[PDB]
RNA sequence: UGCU
């Protein structure tokens, strides 16, 4: 979770003039940035606040009200060392499929660093014994439109001991 | 649609929880049928993030407690990431600070752990 | 007849007509007479609002045949035009949404 | 077929010098507008026979 | 400034009318000029060979 | 088209354009000469300034800087003819604000 | 899950920068190479030849035969250019004085 | 504050056109129209009543700008 | 220039296009900012 | 004009802004005088002066 | 008359003449080795200025451990004009 | 070729 500065030219139709301008801008920004991953930024959750809002222009075309609004929004973007607590939403032979609680099923922990008893035989077996912890390692983003996903990240689980659960 | 700074300022989970609660109450007070039908992903993401934060121990927090915890940790020369993780996790056991918290070497001192536990539990 | 003079500076448009003129002193200086035949062909796109909803409903009910009326309707959701000469004009008028 | 009702009653009816393939059941305009040439455009297109264009 | 490649425009600039009434079609002058240029290039290549 | 037999429309000649300019009805002149006559939406790449298709720039082999733009079809034809004549018009787009 | 990409922007042209293209830029811009001097095929359908003049990969000019580069009709096709190499260079009459 | 206080015919036409377009796009009316089915007539009534919520942003050639309200300007 | 404006299909700078219009919407410039507790 | 066979053109705008600009700027009641010298052109004519 | 060609010429037409092999000798080998050594040693030279990294994520205790350290040469400000002093 |  981190704040990000953005400047958006929001277009409000003429039938929304009876509503408050700031509330309409906030609603439009939320609807535009709800469940979308901005490249090199992360997945935006919602709008935090609006800092600067200059004059509202009306173009000779569509005739709506275009406003250039400066705002801050919350995005989920770890700092390459953040610790998280997720739940195992499945498991694959090459690696477990853990997912943060109802947030995103994109965490793919590589099983190449635990103690030398690591293997998945497709029977949803996590690990042989001697709320799942996660340590983010690196981020990565990719594009979608390439002809006429985008956030997976790397997860680590060192020898944390885990006296509560093996 | 360009961004100015993706790492402007880090915030704990309490601020996100408060923002989500405010958005949810404003939504339930001024719900609009067409606005909701246009984009339903907003409702889903807000509800699920709020449910996740409720599952976490982030409850029973207040800005006064956050400021007191920050001022208590300022005397421990700990870094911003460490204090952010401690505030977001609220560790009740010692092992969570001994091993799970990074940069343990030379920072634990085997005497400051008790003070850290007392401050995070108070 | 070049691109600059015959296709950019001066170009042909639609929704226009050419007809002979005749005198008529019974009309104001700021008024001009238009024949029914040209009026039924030259159409104007009017947006359905909370003011002229009933007028547009009556025009749709009249249809392309009667002079006060319309010829096509473009829905707000889909941009597929609908010809009033075919289909139930009464249903089309009863299902006129804003926009 | 009609994109709205799925009917196959598509008739080409020109409405005041406007060629238009329109459904006869609901009046949904399927296609409209045809691209012709113009006389000066027609005059400046030269007549070449298949004996030369084909090869 | 010295050209070695000619940019043949799309077919939108070169309208072609299929005159089914006879065994021929109406083509613009640009198509004929490009055909002549290609023929001359082929003839030059043949003479070089 | 030109003639009435071929269902032709009227021509707003250079004199009509001059009269409209003298009146100052900018929106009326725009609606007459762009919207109601040869309205079209093209795709222009913001990197090279060339004309794309279906939101794709074949020159740069990318589609991130391609954006839609309203332009007369006659103007697009003029741009294409100039590009054929090796006179390449490089369009540098920007926000309307 | 989903990436944020802007649908449409109210882009306004600022100015037109005229210029010229090198043969390499012409090759990069063009899609196919036109080498056949003929127009149509020997069959009675008189279909346009491939890699030749009047090819449908460089746009379309008929309401029945759509463009091959982009799967759109004539009303929606913008057209595509092509490059034709010359064995010997020639002076550009427009730029001969230059 | 240095330009002419009178509202020119070009400004009148542009404001009336913008208001008519907004009303045709289902904008709220602030004059309580009485059977006026023409958006241009409604815009003219609003202009005569001095209730159009539009502010003219006059730009000087150098780059400066000044805001003038419809109710603040003088009409003829 | 007016000629290139007409050619490109944009409103000419002369006439009604010399100035710009603004909407008199009920708003509040520089709205109150939510205070940051952690920072 | 002289009503001896003149063919005149009639155009219908397709935009509210264009309609308003035409009515205001190109209004007959507002263009009763020419900008050349201010003399009124829309006035009485034959069969009215007499 | 010239025949018509259906397909375009190959993008890389074949040639019956091949490049002459490179000169062999201890001199050429030593020159190659020295050029490789220069390539390897000039990148780490202080004159090889790299792109200044920016937009750091966070500050950590391991910053002092991972801090890149390299001696910087001092230019001759007597010979160099005054417009290049930091 | 006709029209004002
Ligand atoms: C008339 O006797 C001749 C003279 O025509 P031109 O003006 O010499 O034709 P042009 O020079 O080629 O004019 P443009 O360049 O404008 O096209 O030609 C016949 N004729 C010419 N034009 C017309 C016409 O418009 N309509 C008709 N019916 N006949 C025309 C005449 O016999
Ligand atoms: Mg006459
Ligand atoms: Zn149908
Ligand atoms: Zn490009
Ligand atoms: Zn195409």
Helix (H, G, I), strand (E, B) or coil at H11: helix
Set out the domains of chain A in order of their start, with CATH numbers: 2-76 (3.30.1490.120), 82-158 (2.40.50.140)
Q: Does A37 touch chain G (CB under 8 A)?
A: yes
Q: Which residues contact F76 (CB under 8 A, 6 or more apart)?
A: F40, F42, F51, G78
CA B42 to chain centre: 21
Taking CA atoms, H66 is separated from H7, H61, H70, K74, in Å, by: 14, 12, 13, 55
Question: Alpha-carbon distance G30 to G51, whole Å?
Answer: 12
**Contact assignment for D47 to E23 by CB distance below 8 Å:** no
In whole angstroms, what is the distance from residue G66 CA to residue F6 CA?
25
F19 marked as part of a ligand binding site = no
Closest listed residue to residue B101, CA positions, set B119, B116, B111: B116
Using CA atoms, how far apart are residues B77 and K31, in angstroms rounded to an integer? 56
Q: Which of G61, E35, E42 is nearest to D52 (CA)?
A: E35
Distance separating alpha carbons of residues A19 and H27, to the nearest angstrom: 12
Q: Using N-to-C axis directions, what is the helix angle for B63-74 and B80-89, rounded to 10°? A: 140
C74, C77, C79, C80: CA torsion to nearest 10: -80
Q: What is the DSSP letter of J47?
A: T
Q: At what angle do helices B63-74 and B112-121 cross, to 10 degrees?
A: 170
Q: Give per-residue burial for C53-82: e unless 16+ CB within 10 Å, then b.
A: eeebbebbbbbbeeeebbbbbeeeeeebbb
CA C87 to chain centre: 19
Q: What is the DSSP string of D1-55?
A: --TTT----EEE--SSS--EEEETTT-BEEEE------HHHHHHSEEEEHHHHT-
Instruction: Report how many domains make up chain H.
Output: 1
Alpha-carbon torsion (B17, B21, B27, B30), positive or negative: negative
Q: Which residues of K touch E45 (CB under 8 A)?
A: 2
Rounded to 5 degrees, φ, ψ at F49 are: 80, 15
Q: For residue I35, give every residue at least 6 positions away whose Cβ sits within 8 Å of its Cβ, in sequence order, or none.
A: none
**CB of J2 under 7 A from strand L?**
yes
Task: Judge: G51–K4 Cβ closer than 8 Å, yes or no.
Answer: no
Contacting residues of J for H47, CB less than 8 Å apart:
none
- The Cα-based distances of G25 to E4, G28, G31, G89, K66 in angstroms read 12, 5, 12, 16, 46
As a whole number of angstroms, the distance between CA B5 and CA K44 comes to 32
What is the CA(C46)–ligand 3 centre distance, in A? Answer: 24
- Picking from A46, A50, A51, A100, the residue whose alpha carbon sits closest to that of residue A74 is A46
Q: How many CB atoms lie within 10 A of CB K56?
A: 9
As a whole number of angstroms, the distance between CA C21 and CA C39 comes to: 16
3-state secondary structure of G90: strand
Instruction: Give me the numbers of helices (H) and strands (E) for chain E, helices first please.
Output: 1, 3
d(CA B119, CA B117): 5
3-state secondary structure chain A: CEEEEEEEEEEECHHHCCCCHHHHHHHHHHHHCCCEEECCCEEEEEEEEEEEEEEEEECCCCCCEEEEEEEEEEEECCCCCCEEEEEEEEEECCEEEEEECCCEEEECCCCCCCCCCCCCCCCCCCCCCCCEEEEECCCCCCCCCCCCCCCCCCEECCCCCCCCCC
CA distance C22 to J49: 20
Q: Note down the domain range covering H48.
A: 1-76
d(CA K65, CA J16): 69
Instruction: State the method.
Output: cryo-EM
Spatial distance between the Cα atoms of I31 and I34, rounded to a whole number of angstroms: 9
Question: Nearest residue on chain F to H17, judged by CA atoms?
Answer: F27
- Nucleic strand L within 7 A of Cβ J6: yes
Give E8's strand partners. Answer: G82
Q: Are strands C11-12 and F11-12 parallel, antiparallel or unpaired?
A: antiparallel
For position H38, which CATH number holds? Answer: 3.90.940.10
Cα-Cα end-to-end distance for chain H: 20
For residue J3, which nucleotide's C1' is closest to its Cα? L4
Q: Which residue is nearest to nucleotide L4 (CA to C1')?
A: J6
* Angstroms from K60 CA to nearest CA on chain B: 7
Is residue E21 within 8 A of residue D38, CB to CB? The reply is no
The residues, any chain, with a CB within 8 Å of residue B110's CB and separated by 6 or more, are none
As a whole number of angstroms, the distance between CA B90 and CA B66 comes to 11
- Cα–Cα distance between A68 and I19 in angstroms, integer? 19
F and B touch with 3+ CB pairs <8 Å, answer no
CB distance H62 to H43 below 8 Å: no
Which DSSP symbol is given to G52?
Answer: B
How many angstroms separate the CA atoms of A146 and A124, rounded?
A: 36
């Amino acid at each position: 979770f981190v704040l990000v500065e953005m400047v958006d030219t929001v277009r409000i139709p003429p039938w929304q003039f009876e509503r408050k301008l700031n509330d309409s801008i906030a609603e439009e920004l939320n609807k535009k940035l709800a469940n979308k991953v901005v490249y090199n930024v992360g997945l935006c959750i919602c709008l935090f606040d609006i800092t600067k809002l200059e004059d509202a222009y009306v173009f000779p075309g569509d005739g709506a009200s275009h406003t250039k609004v400066h705002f801050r929004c919350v995005v989920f973007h770890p700092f390459l060392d953040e610790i998280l607590i997720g739940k195992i939403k499945g498991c694959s032979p090459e690696g477990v499929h853990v997912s943060l609680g109802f947030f995103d099923d994109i965490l793919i922990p590589p099983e190449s660093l635990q103690q030398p008893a690591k293997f998945d035989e497709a029977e949803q077996v996590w690990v042989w014994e001697y709320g799942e912890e996660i340590r983010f390692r690196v981020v990565d983003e990719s594009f979608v439109d390439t002809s006429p996903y985008t956030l997976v990240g790397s997860i680590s689980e060192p020898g944390l001991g885990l006296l509560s659960w093996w | 649609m360009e961004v100015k700074d993706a790492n402007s300022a880090l915030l704990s989970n309490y601020e996100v929880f408060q923002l989500l609660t405010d958005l949810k109450e404003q939504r339930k007070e001024s719900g609009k049928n067409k606005h909701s039908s246009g984009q339903q992903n907003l409702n889903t993401i807000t509800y699920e993030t709020l449910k996740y934060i409720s599952k976490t121990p982030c409850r029973h927090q207040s800005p006064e407690i956050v400021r007191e915890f920050l001022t208590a940790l300022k005397s421990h020369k700990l870094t911003k990431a460490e204090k952010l993780q401690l505030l977001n996790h609220r560790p009740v056991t010692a092992v969570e600070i001994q091993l799970m918290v990074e940069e343990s070497e030379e920072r634990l001192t085997e005497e400051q752990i008790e003070a850290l536990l007392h401050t995070v539990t108070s | 007849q070049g691109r600059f003079r015959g296709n950019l500076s001066g170009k042909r448009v639609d929704f226009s007509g050419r007809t002979v003129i005749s005198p008529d002193p019974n009309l104001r200086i700021d008024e001009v007479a238009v024949p029914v035949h040209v009026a039924k062909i030259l159409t104007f796109p009017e947006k359905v609002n909370k003011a002229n909803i009933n007028f547009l409903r009556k025009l749709v009910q009249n249809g392309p045949e009667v002079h006060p009326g319309a010829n096509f309707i473009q829905q707000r959701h889909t941009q597929m035009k609908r010809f009033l000469k075919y289909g139930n004009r009464e249903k089309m008028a009863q299902e006129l949404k804003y926009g | 077929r009609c994109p709205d009702c799925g009917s196959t009653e598509l008739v080409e009816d020109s409405h005041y010098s406007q060629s238009q393939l329109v459904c006869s059941d609901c009046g949904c305009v399927v296609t409209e507008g045809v691209l012709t040439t113009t006389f000066s455009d027609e005059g400046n297109l030269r007549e070449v026979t298949y004996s030369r264009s084909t090869g | 400034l010295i050209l070695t490649r000619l940019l043949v425009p799309p077919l939108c600039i070169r309208p072609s009318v299929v005159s089914d009434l006879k065994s021929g079609t109406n083509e613009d002058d640009l198509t004929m000029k490009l055909t002549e240029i290609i023929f001359l290039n082929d003839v030059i290549k043949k003479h070089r060979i | 088209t030109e003639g009435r037999s071929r269902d032709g429309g009227l021509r707003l000649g250079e004199m009509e354009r001059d009269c409209l300019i003298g009146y100052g009805a900018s929106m009326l002149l725009l609606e007459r000469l762009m919207i109601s006559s040869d309205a079209f939406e093209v795709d222009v790449c913001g990197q090279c300034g060339l004309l794309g298709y279906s939101g794709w720039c074949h020159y740069c082999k990318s589609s991130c800087h391609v954006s839609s733009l309203r332009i007369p079809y006659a103007c697009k034809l003029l741009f294409q003819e100039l590009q054929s004549m090796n006179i390449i018009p490089r369009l540098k787009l920007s926000k309307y604000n | 899950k989903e990436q944020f990409r802007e649908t449409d922007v109210a882009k306004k042209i600022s100015h037109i920068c005229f210029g010229m293209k090198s043969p390499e830029e012409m090759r990069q811009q063009a899609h196919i190479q036109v080498v056949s001097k003929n127009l149509y095929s020997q069959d009675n359908q008189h279909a346009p030849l491939l890699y030749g003049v009047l090819d449908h990969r460089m746009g379309t000019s008929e309401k029945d035969r759509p463009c091959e580069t982009c799967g759109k009709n004539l009303a929606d096709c913008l057209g595509h250019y092509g490059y034709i190499d010359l064995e010997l260079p020639c002076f550009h009459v427009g730029y001969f004085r230059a | 504050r240095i330009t002419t206080p009178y509202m020119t015919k070009y400004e009148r036409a542009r404001v009336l056109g913008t208001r008519a377009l907004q009303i045709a796009m289902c904008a709220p009316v602030m004059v309580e129209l009485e059977g006026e089915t023409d958006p241009l007539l409604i815009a003219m009534k609003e202009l005569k009543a001095r209730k159009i919520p539009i502010i003219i942003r006059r730009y000087l050639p150098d780059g400066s700008y000044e805001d003038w309200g419809v109710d603040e300007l003088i009409i003829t | 220039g007016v000629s290139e404006c007409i050619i490109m299909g944009i409103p000419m700078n002369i006439g009604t296009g010399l100035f710009k219009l603004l909407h008199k919407a009920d708003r509040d410039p520089n709205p109150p900012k939510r205070p940051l507790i952690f920072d | 004009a002289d009503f001896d066979g003149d063919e005149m053109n009639l155009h219908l705008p397709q935009t509210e802004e264009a309609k308003a600009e035409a009515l205001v700027l190109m209004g007959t009641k507002a263009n009763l005088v020419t900008p050349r010298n201010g003399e009124p052109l829309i006035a009485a004519i034959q069969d009215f002066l007499t | 008359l010239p025949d018509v060609v259906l397909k375009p010429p190959p993008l890389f037409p074949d040639t019956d003449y091949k490049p002459v092999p490179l000169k062999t000798g201890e001199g050429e080998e030593y020159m190659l080795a020295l050029k490789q050594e220069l390539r390897e040693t000039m990148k780490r030279m202080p004159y090889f200025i790299e792109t200044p990294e920016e937009r750091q994520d966070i500050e950590r205790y391991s910053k002092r451990y991972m801090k890149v350290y390299k001696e910087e040469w001092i230019p001759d400000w007597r010979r160099l004009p005054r417009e290049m002093m930091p």
